[PDB]
Write a protein that binds this ligand. Structure first.
Ligand SMILES: Nc1ncnc2c1ncn2[C@@H]1O[C@H](COP(=O)(O)OP(=O)(O)O)[C@@H](O)[C@H]1O
Ligand SMILES: [Mg+2]
Length: 856
């Protein structure tokens, strides 16, 4: 049915006024009501590109490669190469004397399997422009190889001819390795070992250094070029992170046009053919250590040797003959869509019976299943405090709490690790004798025309199960407990689909064009494994649609801003808009918070009472998050203990808030550096109960940014998608009712943030909006019949024709002004009166009073 949209009469008077002042014409009402006239409107191009290459140069005196700038004051700034080489050679032998715990550790370094091969490696790397270092996970190629390379260059007095960039796919890997390698050198991060992840960096010195960054960070610094670098180490290639696959394309163009450069690809035990063939049949340096085999078992065997009982074709129904009558009878009572918490619980205390000491590594998909499984054991008898030691490893936990997994345990105690697939190839634990495998992955599923980053649990590869097994048996003959039928193993993929095949490419596309590497399609066609066509088309369509590219597929001044922002391009455009309305700080804050988990500490079930009160009366998860942020930033002014007090009292995660903050600041600086003034990015206090026109527009711009994640409320926990299918409220949301209950809303229009798919479908992080916001920013294709209005062809609205089409115009005028200010962002100071009245009209229609709503 439609919605009874009740505007004022003198408001409609205003919307037609401004539209006249802007010298634009409203699409007239249909003569025949059955004619579905569309309200949408629409509206210099630049010369095209040619296939080009990122420039390279080796390390230089008076050039910091980590700040990508000159240095005209200090020892190195003034000194000569040999001076530095000599000096630094001495510093280490000075250090060698005086530190009495350094050689304590350096011996530990030489016990690592990769130690053996140091000669062969350095030998290969020297004589070949590209190298692959294949070897098992645990040999120590991550930590050691970049040292081996530096150590050598130091003690041949070529220290200043050495700068190493080491890319890691995960944020956590980059930093924690940087920490480890700096420890193994008797230092703290900053001396010779730096890092650089998204929104956080501890840079090293300009010479004889090692930089551990993420691929995205490196890619966005390549506008300056790969200047002042001797070696480029691309670790964990076998993971097939889409950004690594992309980087490899870039690097291959480099090694052609600059063969002096040195590249080092590092991989687990997989087929490295395509990589070797890609890089001109480059040498492979195999690496291996003394490792023990493992008996692996499957979900038949697990139930066999515990006597367990619980309360696409199903593979649990299929079972072997030699397995007993009760074995089958049990397993078939348990679907494969969810992993059995109850079985693995019983499977742990079977390991007791084997009476062999060691740690059990449990593979699960996601924080959700790890945090539940933890509270399943820890808050349960048998599993006492002094019997078992249950450590989680999400990569979303304090980095102190991560390290626990490595250091040993008091004797007669079992160390249980509930980790993600980080521990599959990225990190190795020492005590691991046993492994339990969910045989499942957590992947963002996003195909063409989804426009929804949808997290979904899926089956792992045969290769995955193989690699998860090998974690057991780095100490003694081990055991591996696969929680998948023997039938389900047969119906598994051998390898998993690489990210290139199943990820958006609009971020990759902006990069391509910023770096002037040629055409989006042409470039990705050179990939080790190119993406599907429709993905490239979708990426191209998507960037054109928001004027990041012209129709000639070249980078507009807007797209450049979006290229320099390290966030989703829509949120980048949302921020630029907010700057124009002088709500830049507010809207950057929301952007930043997308890059981090929710700062609420949910004990389980749904949300609590006190947390929901941050929402206010705007029925918004986004305002909940924005309200805590205001309360936190005010409370932090007390001091360190005052900050944590607040957080402890309100049950908030203090780490998350400091990260969202630091990210907000960094976003803010890119806009400042882009030319936007300071005054449009100042902190602006707001209420979440009274009226707030600053916060009205901020909700409006959130409608834009999060489009097209829209829904409509009907029943208590029922909502309907944009397409029309039936979805739910997530239990974390503030707009979620309590069990059985319901709540009325001043509007059923919600722009939601994210959608999970594990048990069913559901929407997460919901924010209420008015009809006018839906029309103005959260709806592309809209049709009028004179009285009734159709929005994105599944949402109907009873409303004036002239007003509905006057709004769709403002949008088009706003988009025009976006273009205008992206040519010169300092424009927003001296805005012509027509423009500033267009911003006030938008401000007006943002409010709920103008849509016949009040929040009480
Ligand atoms: N933070 C750490 N604390 C203690 N030991 C560590 C740490 N990081 C790595 N190790 C140890 O270093 C060894 C090699 O690690 P790494 O260089 O990551 O290997 P690779 O990447 O080749 O699998 C492993 O045996 C592991 O136990
Ligand atoms: Mg590694």
């Amino acid at each position: 049915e439609p919605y009874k949209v009740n505007l004022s009469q003198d408001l409609e008077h205003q919307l037609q006024n401004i539209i006249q002042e802007l010298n634009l014409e409203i699409v007239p009402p249909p003569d025949d009501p059955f004619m579905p006239v569309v309200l949408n409107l629409g509206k210099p191009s630049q010369r095209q590109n040619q296939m080009g290459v990122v420039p390279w140069s080796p390390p230089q005196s008076n050039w910091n490669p980590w700040t990508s700038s000159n240095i005209d004051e200090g020892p190195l700034a003034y000194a000569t190469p040999e001076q530095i080489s000599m000096d630094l050679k001495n510093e280490l032998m000075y250090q060698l004397e005086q530190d009495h715990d350094l050689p304590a550790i350096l011996q530990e370094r030489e016990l690592l399997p990769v130690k053996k091969f140091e000669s062969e490696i350095l030998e290969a790397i020297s004589q070949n422009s590209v190298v692959i270092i294949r070897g098992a996970t645990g040999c120590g190629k991550t930590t050691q190889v970049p040292q081996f390379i530096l150590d050598d260059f130091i003690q041949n007095d070529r220290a200043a001819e050495c700068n190493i960039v080491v890319t890691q796919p995960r944020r956590i890997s980059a930093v924690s390795v940087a920490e480890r390698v700096a420890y193994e050198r008797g230092e703290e991060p900053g001396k010779s070992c730096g890092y650089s992840v998204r929104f956080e960096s501890v840079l090293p010195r300009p010479y004889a250094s090692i930089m551990f960054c993420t691929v995205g960070v490196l890619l966005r610094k390549l506008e300056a070029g790969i200047r002042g670098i001797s070696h480029v180490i691309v670790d964990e290639i076998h993971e097939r992170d889409i950004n690594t696959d992309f980087l490899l394309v870039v690097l291959r163009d480099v090694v052609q046009a600059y063969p002096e450069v040195r590249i080092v690809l590092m991989s687990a035990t997989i087929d490295t053919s395509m990589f070797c063939e890609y890089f001109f049949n480059c040498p492979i340096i195999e690496v291996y250590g003394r490792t023990y085999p493992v008996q692996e078992y499957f979900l038949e065997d697990c139930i066999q040797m515990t006597h367990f009982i619980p309360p696409d074709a199903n593979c649990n129904l299929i079972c072997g003959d030699e397995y007993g009558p009760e074995t089958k009878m049990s397993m078939a009572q348990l679907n494969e869509k969810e992993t059995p918490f109850e079985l693995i619980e019983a499977l742990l205390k079977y390991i007791e019976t084997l009476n062999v000491p060691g740690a059990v590594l449990v593979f699960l998909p996601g924080w959700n299943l790890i945090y539940t499984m933890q509270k399943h054991l820890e808050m349960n008898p048998d599993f006492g405090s002094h019997r078992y030691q249950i450590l989680p490893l999400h990569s979303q936990i304090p980095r102190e709490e991560q390290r626990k997994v490595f250091d040993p345990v008091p004797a007669g105690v079992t160390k249980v690790i509930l980790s993600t697939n980080i521990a599959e190839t990225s990190i190795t634990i020492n005590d691991v004798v046993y492994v339990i495998d969910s045989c499942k992955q957590k992947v963002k599923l996003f195909t063409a025309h989804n426009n929804m980053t949808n997290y979904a649990t899926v089956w792992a590869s045969k290769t995955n199960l193989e690699q998860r097994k090998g974690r057991a048996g780095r100490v003694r003959p081990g055991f591996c407990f696969h929680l998948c039928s023997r039938a389900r193993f047969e119906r598994l993929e051998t390898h998993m689909t690489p990210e290139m095949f199943r990820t958006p490419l609009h971020e990759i596309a902006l990069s391509i064009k910023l770096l002037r590497l040629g055409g989006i399609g042409q470039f990705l066609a050179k990939a080790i494994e190119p993406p599907p066509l429709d993905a490239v088309i979708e990426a191209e369509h998507t960037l054109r649609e928001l004027d990041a590219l012209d129709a000639n597929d070249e980078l507009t001044p807007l797209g450049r801003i979006l290229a320099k922002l390290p966030i989703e391009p829509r949120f980048g455009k949302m921020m630029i808009m907010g700057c124009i309305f002088y709500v830049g700080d507010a809207v950057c804050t929301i952007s930043a918070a997308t890059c981090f988990p929710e700062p609420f500490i949910s004990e389980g079930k749904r949300l609590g009472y006190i947390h929901r009160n941050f929402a206010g009366n705007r029925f918004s998860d986004h305002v909940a998050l924005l309200s805590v942020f205001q309360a936190w930033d005010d409370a932090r002014m007390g001091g360190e203990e005052a900050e944590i007090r607040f957080c402890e009292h309100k049950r908030l995660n203090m780490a998350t808030l400091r990260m969202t903050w630091e990210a907000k600041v960094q976003l803010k600086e890119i806009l400042i550096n882009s030319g936007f003034p300071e005054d449009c990015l100042l902190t602006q206090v707001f209420t979440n109960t009274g009226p707030d026109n600053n916060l009205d527009v901020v909700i409006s711009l959130l409608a834009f940014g999060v489009y097209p994640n829209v829904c409509y409320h009907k029943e208590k926990r029922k909502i309907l998608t944009t397409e029309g299918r039936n979805a739910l409220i997530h239990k974390s949301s503030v707009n979620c009712p309590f069990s059985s209950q319901d709540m009325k809303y001043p509007s059923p229009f919600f722009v939601f943030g994210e959608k999970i798919r594990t048990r069913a479908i559901s929407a997460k992080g919901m924010t209420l909006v008015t009809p006018l916001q839906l029309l103005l920013f959260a709806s592309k294709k809209v049709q009028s019949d004179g009285q009734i209005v159709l929005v994105d062809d599944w949402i109907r609205l009873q409303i004036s024709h002239e007003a509905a089409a006057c709004i769709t115009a403002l949008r088009a005028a706003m988009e025009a002004l976006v273009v205008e200010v992206t040519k010169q962002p300092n424009i927003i100071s001296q805005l012509d009166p027509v423009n500033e009245h267009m911003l006030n009209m938008i401000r007006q229609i943002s409010r709920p009073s103008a849509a016949g709503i009040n929040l009480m």
